[PDB]
Amino acid sequence: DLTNCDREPIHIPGYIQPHGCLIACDNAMRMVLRHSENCGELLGLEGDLNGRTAEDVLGKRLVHDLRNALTVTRPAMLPAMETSDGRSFDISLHRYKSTTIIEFEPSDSDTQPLGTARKMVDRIREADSVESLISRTTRLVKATLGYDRVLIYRFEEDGAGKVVSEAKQPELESFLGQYFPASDIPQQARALYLKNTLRIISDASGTPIPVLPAVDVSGEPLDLSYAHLRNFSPIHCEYLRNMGVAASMSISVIVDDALWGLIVCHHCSPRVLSMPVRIAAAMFGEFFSMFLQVLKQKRRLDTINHAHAALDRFLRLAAHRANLEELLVDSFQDFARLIPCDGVGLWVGNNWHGHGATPPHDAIPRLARFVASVSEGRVWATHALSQAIPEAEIYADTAAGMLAIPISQVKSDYLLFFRKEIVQNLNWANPEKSYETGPMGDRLTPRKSFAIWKESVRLQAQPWSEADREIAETARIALVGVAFHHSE
Amino acid sequence: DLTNCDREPIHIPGYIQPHGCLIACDNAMRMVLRHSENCGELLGLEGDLNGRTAEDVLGKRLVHDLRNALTVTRPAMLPAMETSDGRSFDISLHRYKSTTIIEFEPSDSDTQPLGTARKMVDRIREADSVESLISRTTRLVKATLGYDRVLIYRFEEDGAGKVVSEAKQPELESFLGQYFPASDIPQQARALYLKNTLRIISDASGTPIPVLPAVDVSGEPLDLSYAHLRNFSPIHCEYLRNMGVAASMSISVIVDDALWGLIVCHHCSPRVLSMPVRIAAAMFGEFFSMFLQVLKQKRRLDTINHAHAALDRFLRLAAHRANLEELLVDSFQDFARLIPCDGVGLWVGNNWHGHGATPPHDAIPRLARFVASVSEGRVWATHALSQAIPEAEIYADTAAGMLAIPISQVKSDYLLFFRKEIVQNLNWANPEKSYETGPMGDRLTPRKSFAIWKESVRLQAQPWSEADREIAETARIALVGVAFHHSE
Ligand SMILES: *C/C=C1/C(=C/C2=NC(=C\c3[nH]c(/C=C4\NC(=O)C(C=C)=C4C)c(C)c3CCC(=O)O)/C(CCC(=O)O)=C2C)NC(=O)C1C
Ligand SMILES: *C/C=C1/C(=C/C2=NC(=C\c3[nH]c(/C=C4\NC(=O)C(C=C)=C4C)c(C)c3CCC(=O)O)/C(CCC(=O)O)=C2C)NC(=O)C1C
């Protein structure tokens, strides 16, 4: 099924990843309800474990220490824990839907979990712009965790993902500046990714180990939402195998409690991160998120400060010039400085004055009449002009988006901002690389995903941000206010 | 009924105000469905009008011009229109719920509707602060429209109204700085006030003239939402009569599409504003709203700019000092500069350091433990501390509100901001004046309304604004970020 993607319940796969073993106990960790087939192979146990008491299975010495963890749904990390037979394991212990889930993996005592991160964070803390934090992060994460490719994948308004930063081995293909459909990361995944900060895929071509029982007596599956060993969707694993990506590690970037995007790592060989390096990467993820949040806030405060200053400058000029209509005709191009636009236009006294990428002179009367019907003396905007006026499809390559600012309360005069269709402004330079395809078809390749997105945004501009509308509303109040001062 | 206030359907009173007459016609203004009893007295008509055709009743010459108005639910203002018998009327014409409503009133051709407003707006446009716009507006509106009292009544988070500005005759009582319950202006009214910019009460002791029919054949009343003659609730009219207020004119202040508050005018004698002065006041209302919106935005941008600068200054100090714990103990009082607070405290290394109005030393351990349970490494805040900790009622007169900023990701260390209970910070200086009371009791007086509000906010502080939380979150990321840099 490669449609209704949001359907698949990824949280309850009924499988885990080979690189560790999973024991699910009751709410109070007394009786083993479920286990992973490989529990035997790794712990050195014989036979079925389901019905045996936690104290019996793992040991009275270990089960005691694990009870003190849950005394804290944030998974408790217990590095280098000992079994009765002496073997040493790193243990992830969490409690979700009144089910205690214990994950075991071969132990790492070499790496330091705080020290590693403290140095990584130190290098991104002093970044003074969103672009500087982002650029350095991919490069940094690659050098440190040694993944063949690191992307920052940022989510657009429409749910589509743009690759805004990339560090990679020279040999590998670049996805920098390419967009991907909202469907490529469906809604239940983003819901899960807001819960699980960090995520591993040890092997995309690995054999997934089943959890027994898959479904229990009461007829409910084992929710592996907060289980780091949870096996990933076969749709995504095929997608990674088609890209020649054997292993994966993604970090959830959380800004203002939204999912802003992912730090996504690819490895061409199989790769297991140890509990300690996964804690470090998780901490870096949190700090990277916090800094990007504050840098985004500073940019918003700056963008608007800069627009306020521009309008004060223009209101001081309007005090000196007698003819305001004359001042606007000489000045209107300068408003393209407030709101990112490919063109700006002035419709004043049934006359049209254009600058940059605007619709054709003959097409404006239609537009001016239309805006004057739906505006209602407030800011009107759209990124899909042709959806509002079919006639406007002809010039979508020039002006696909329009934001309209009324400049007179009384008269029907407008300041019109325009944007080219997003595929025009597209800067990726080509996806010449051909990709091998598995059972499910050529849909599961970056080449097709990109082709799909490009159709989904045809005749459509870069949407107007909250900041573009905030500035536009402030410009309306400034222009309407000073146009009243010069009444006829 | 002086409870469940939101019940009363003020929009369909089945009455109008004496100072004009009302004719409701069908959707296309052909047949007179309803009229006000006084239609006869003012238009010079005899008998019932309900069933007679619009062309017959008002005239073919007039009904034609009225059809061209609805060719525009914004009421069309038609000043100095003539009837068949020669009489001259100002006419408000609107169409709501497929019912054309025509309001007539004695004509004013003396006042200029734009010129008056253009001068008023000119005096508020150059205001550079919310306090300066507000202060000048009451004073200005009083001098111009000549009302005995003008208030600006601002709505609080909890729906309560504060009187933030006042111009009045020396003899009259001051309501400056007094709050009023959310119930005093119920929800259906605010819903109506978002629709009707401006509102008149010609006489609070006037005899309301009934609309016939009150309820029609189809069993639906006449919606007078956009009718300027709509009779006001008898609850409010009694309230005004108890205040010695004979007439009223309120203006809806709309900021970011919210109802921010009202410019409320009181007159001790009866007072009808003419259509032209009502248009002017309506225009001023719009401009006053637009400017206050932009001044509010500038203040928000400034408040946060100022907090960013403060934290950068503090992060530069943290680079020089080795012991960060020492720097915070010396500096924490300075954070009271970021967020308006009556006290600030530092809980670091199980030690307490206080500055300003904070809870007692002995009470902090309880607080520090509590915050450390519900915080979850993010900013936690409340204006009703005693609702979270009953024990905290004892010191509500000192600290009724608390905002808590984590300063360490690892350790349980907090920066605690405090606010006194709102009745402490209360600056109104007394309501000695006694008020006469009508049939419905002493509830309908400012004295009682204020007593009611004062109980509704006991043990409660001034709520933490979006701006206080925005700054607090930015301070968390700054302090948590630099505390990681100085790991143990
Ligand atoms: C219709 C179903 C589809 C689908 C489902 C799906 N995708 C999921 C995760 C996921 N997808 C991406 C996409 C990319 N990663 C890349 O590196 C590139 C490179 C060009 C692309 C396009 C990513 C990053 C992820 C996140 C996986 C991770 O956390 O590492 C999932 C959720 C996986 C899970 O089981 O948790 C599902 C389901 N993807 C499709 O493309 C389609 C058609
Ligand atoms: C339980 C019912 C009550 C109630 C209902 C009610 N109030 C309405 C309007 C209204 N109330 C105020 C309040 C004041 N105005 C003042 O000047 C002062 C001065 C101290 C106070 C406290 C105001 C300003 C208004 C707005 C009226 C206007 O637009 O001029 C209404 C709506 C009236 C209508 O029919 O449109 C209703 C209903 N008010 C109560 O106090 C109570 C108990």
What distance in Å separates the CA atoms of residue A437 and residue A96, rounded to the nearest whole number?
A: 37
Whether residues B291 and B418 share a domain: the answer is no
- The answer to whether the CB of A3 falls within 8 A of the CB of A203 is no
Strands, E assignment, A169-204 = 179-180, 198-201
- For tokens 């970090």, name the residue: A251
Structure tokens at A463: 């949407």
**With an 8 Å Cβ cutoff, are A294 and B121 in contact?**
no
Whether residue B304 lies inside any domain: the answer is no
- The answer to whether the CB of B401 falls within 8 A of the CB of B359 is no
Count of C-beta atoms within a 10 Å radius of residue A266: 25
What distance in Å separates the CA atoms of residue B454 and residue B468, rounded to the nearest whole number?
A: 24
Q: Which residues does residue B266 pair with via DSSP β-bridges, in sequence order?
A: B149, B248
What distance in Å separates the CA atoms of residue B181 and residue A240, rounded to the nearest whole number?
A: 61
Whether residues A101 and A118 share a domain: the answer is no
Phi, psi (rounded to 5 degrees) for B415? -105, 115
Element (H, E) at B315: helix B275-320
Whether residue A441 lies inside any domain: the answer is no
What number of residues does chain B have? 488
Element (H, E) at A292: helix A275-320
Q: Which positions ≥6 away from B331 have C-beta within 8 Å? A: B314, B317
Structure tokens at A149: 């490719």
- For tokens 């005691």, name the residue: A64
Q: How far is CA B235 from CA B184, B260, B437, in A?
A: 10, 23, 12
Domain final residue pick, A106, A126, A151? A106
Q: Which positions ≥6 away from B380 have C-beta within 8 Å? A: B371, B374, B403, B404
Substitution site in A163, A185, A193 for ligand 1 pocket (most atoms within 8 Å of beta carbon): A185
Whether residues B261 and B346 share a domain: the answer is no
Substitution site in B15, B147, B232, B236 for ligand 2 pocket (most atoms within 8 Å of beta carbon): B236
Which candidate from A283, A290, A487 shows the least CB-CB separation from B118? A487
Whether residues A191 and A250 share a domain: the answer is yes
Q: How far is A274 from chain B (nearest CA, A)?
A: 21
**Closest residue by Cα to residue B358 from B346, B369, B344:** B344
- For tokens 């306020």, name the residue: A308
Orientation of helix A466-485 relative to helix B113-124, angle to 10° = 120
Whether residue A87 lies inside any domain: the answer is yes
Count of C-beta atoms within a 10 Å radius of residue A330: 13
What distance in Å separates the CA atoms of residue A388 and residue A62, rounded to the nearest whole number?
A: 66
Supply the CATH number for residue A351's domain.
3.30.450.270
Question: Residues A471, A477, A483, A485: what is their CA dihedral angle, to the nearest 10 degrees?
Answer: -130
What distance in Å separates the CA atoms of residue A297 and residue B470, rounded to the nearest whole number?
A: 9
**Closest residue by Cα to residue A199 from A168, A167, A240:** A240
Residue of A nearest to B301 (CA): A301
Domain final residue pick, A82, A106, A130? A106
Structure tokens at B264: 């409320």
Whether the bond into A186 is cis, omega within 30 of 0: no
**Closest residue by Cα to residue A21 from A96, A91, A113:** A91
Residues framing ligand 2 (Cβ under 6 A): B 2, 5, 8, 10, 151, 153, 175, 180, 183-186, 189, 199, 232-233, 235-236, 239, 248, 250, 262, 264, 266, 443-444, 446, 449
Angle at B347 (CA atoms; ends B346, B353), nearest 5 degrees = 50
**With an 8 Å Cβ cutoff, are A305 and B301 in contact?**
yes
Supply the CATH number for residue B69's domain.
3.30.450.20
Q: Is A372 on the interface with B (CB under 8 A)?
A: no
Whether residues B462 and B477 share a domain: the answer is yes
Whether residue A447 lies inside any domain: the answer is no
The β-bridge relationship of strands A21-25 and A32-36 is antiparallel
* Cα distance from N-terminal residue to C-terminal residue, chain B: 65
Q: How far is CA A443 from CA A435, A449, A458, B256, in A?
A: 11, 7, 19, 44
Q: Which positions ≥6 away from B247 have C-beta within 8 Å? A: B200, B201, B202, B203, B204, B266, B267, B269, B270, B271, B272
Looking at chain B, the residues that come just before a C–N gap of over 2.5 A are: 72, 429
Whether residue B306 lies inside any domain: the answer is no
Whether residues B228 and B256 share a domain: the answer is yes
Residue of A nearest to B74 (CA): A376
| DSSP-derived 3-state class of residue B200 | strand
Whether residues A118 and A258 share a domain: the answer is yes
What distance in Å separates the CA atoms of residue B222 and residue B34, rounded to the nearest whole number?
A: 8
- The answer to whether the CB of A463 falls within 8 A of the CB of A383 is yes
Ligand 1 atom nearest to CA at A266: 17
Q: Which residues does residue B162 pair with via DSSP β-bridges, in sequence order?
A: B154, B179
- The answer to whether the CB of B270 falls within 8 A of the CB of A270 is no
Q: Which positions ≥6 away from B152 have C-beta within 8 Å? A: B134, B137, B138, B163, B164, B165, B166, B253, B261, B262, B263, B264
Nearest CA to ligand 2 atom 3: B184
Q: Which range marks the domain in which residue A30 is found?
A: 15-106
Count of C-beta atoms within a 10 Å radius of residue A89: 23
Q: What is the largest CA-CA distance in chain A?
A: 94
Whether residues B243 and B137 share a domain: the answer is yes
- Split into its structural domains, chain A has a count of 3
Chain B contacts of A406, Cβ < 8 Å? none
What distance in Å separates the CA atoms of residue A73 and residue A367, rounded to the nearest whole number?
A: 54
Q: How far is CA B468 from CA A131, B34, B403, in A?
A: 28, 53, 9
- The answer to whether the CB of B475 falls within 8 A of the CB of B338 is yes
What distance in Å separates the CA atoms of residue B426 and residue A69, rounded to the nearest whole number?
A: 49
Residue type, A96: Y
User: Could you tell me if residue A59 is left (phi over 0), alpha (psi between -120 and 50 degrees) or otherwise beta?
Assistant: left
- For tokens 């968390």, name the residue: B476
Count of C-beta atoms within a 10 Å radius of residue A4: 9
Whether residues B250 and B387 share a domain: the answer is no
Per the entry, the structure determination technique was X-ray
What distance in Å separates the CA atoms of residue A83 and residue B406, rounded to the nearest whole number?
A: 37
Structure tokens at B181: 């319950």
Phi, psi (rounded to 5 degrees) for A244? 70, 25
Whether residue B390 lies inside any domain: the answer is yes
Q: Which positions ≥6 away from B93 have C-beta within 8 Å? A: B66, B69, B70, B75, B76, B78, B100, B101, B102, B103
Whether residues B120 and B100 share a domain: the answer is no
Those of residues 278-297 in A touching chain B at CB distance below 8 A are 283, 286-287, 290-291, 293-294, 297
Whether residues A224 and A150 share a domain: the answer is yes
Task: Give the DSSP letter string of B144-188.
Answer: HH--SEEEEEEEPTTS-EEEEEEEE-TTSPP-TT-EE-GGGS-HH
Whether residues A143 and A252 share a domain: the answer is yes
Supply the CATH number for residue A141's domain.
3.30.450.40
Whether the bond into B406 is cis, omega within 30 of 0: no
Domain final residue pick, A73, A106, A139? A106
Q: Is A120 on the interface with B (CB under 8 A)?
A: no
3-state DSSP: chain A helix, strand, coil percent, rounded to 5? Answer: 40, 25, 40
* Cα distance from N-terminal residue to C-terminal residue, chain A: 65
CA of B10 to the centre of ligand 2 (A): 11
Whether residue B440 lies inside any domain: the answer is no
Helix and strand numbers (H, E) in chain A are 13, 18
| DSSP-derived 3-state class of residue B418 | strand
Whether residue A449 lies inside any domain: the answer is no
Test the A interface: residue of B118, B126, B484, B486 with most A CBs within 10 Å = B484
Count of C-beta atoms within a 10 Å radius of residue B164: 17
What number of residues does chain A have? 488
Long-range pairs, A25-31, Cβ under 8 A, ≥24: A25/A54, A25/A99, A25/A100, A25/A102, A26/A99, A26/A100, A27/A95, A27/A98, A27/A99, A27/A100, A28/A100, A29/A54, A29/A63, A29/A66, A29/A67, A29/A70, A29/A100, A29/A102, A30/A54, A30/A55
CA of B144 to the centre of ligand 2 (A): 24
- The answer to whether the CB of B149 falls within 8 A of the CB of B172 is yes
